[PDB]
Amino acid sequence: DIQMTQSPSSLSASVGDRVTITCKASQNVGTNVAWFQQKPGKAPKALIYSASYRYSGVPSRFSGSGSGTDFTLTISSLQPEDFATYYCQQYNSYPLTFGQGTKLEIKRTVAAPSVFIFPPSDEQLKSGTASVVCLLNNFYPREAKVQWKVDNALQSGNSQESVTEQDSKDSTYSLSSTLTLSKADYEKHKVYACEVTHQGLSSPVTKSFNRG
């Protein structure tokens, strides 16, 4: 199967900027390359066929080029609606193969997260499982590091994170870190703290509580 390598995997740009996405084929594919746009929760939408031709309705700011093994999509005059994931696809031979995709997100000014910590409810403690939640609210850029400490022991493997898509009004993100413990292991310890680092914080921000 012909492999389509897309670069970069992620891309940040401001409204009005010009962007270039590239895509390398493991073999020759002529000009049988297509480009797709996809927004979260929706089906993909075709942009380019034959490497350089636009499907009906696709505005001129989307232009594709290339032949053989190297292909690029160029998106000038970026509009807010253009920030989404893009996929190249070869259809020269079977099976049809897509690139891994490029997510394009809106650049804005740095914003520090607001940190809140939430101890598990007594209700949940009756069920035998304890879940501790650390909230990072309305921050940019997306990269933010969370550290869970319980009696000052760095936790590994027992936490999961979930980040929203970029907000449509202010372009910030929010992030959720949930630490799951056994009620027993939750009873054995006193101090629970999540430590946050981020480009908007000159030093780490700590939020903590004591079981009780």
Binding site: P44, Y87, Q124
Partner: protein
Amino acid sequence: QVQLVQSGAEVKKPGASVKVSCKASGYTFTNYDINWVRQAPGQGLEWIGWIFPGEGSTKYNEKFKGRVTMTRDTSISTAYMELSRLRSDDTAVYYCATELVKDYYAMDYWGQGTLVTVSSASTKGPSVFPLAPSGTAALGCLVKDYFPEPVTVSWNSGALTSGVHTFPAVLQSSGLYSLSSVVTVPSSSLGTQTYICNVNHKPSNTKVDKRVEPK
């Protein structure tokens, strides 16, 4: 304009099979291929194959050949993709699509997508736990241990929408999903205004309204 309507969501156990439908209208059903592509949660696109509804001919991705069958019922303008010997890595949204290329336009058309969940888990409503608030305060609800997706979350029966963040679900190692919904509100109304999060879970006919109050 051309439209593709797909069958509803499906939950399947490992080894079982699933059959998704794609109802087409607005064009000569027998003149164009129906392609099928899928997308695992948080992944890229993968092509499955296509069927030409005119003569029933097909073409499959080698990865699935021997395990997938595409069919069409021309009388109802409906194509079908049947995937057998389902494994957990078959969980994804499945799309049918077609392409009309005429003299004065070229356009792709897509179905709305079908979610297929391949899991040994069984239906279970979510347990909702309050995230109690400690000028701007944060409170929320932890919607834990539900199957299958999706849950729907609102606050104060839809009134409170400013400052709400409902996070995408994550599949816990127990085979059940979990998410949290949070809202920032003025710290002064904590003791006067009342905050209720509403959690819908259609697969289980569960409807919970959990009031979140400062402890």
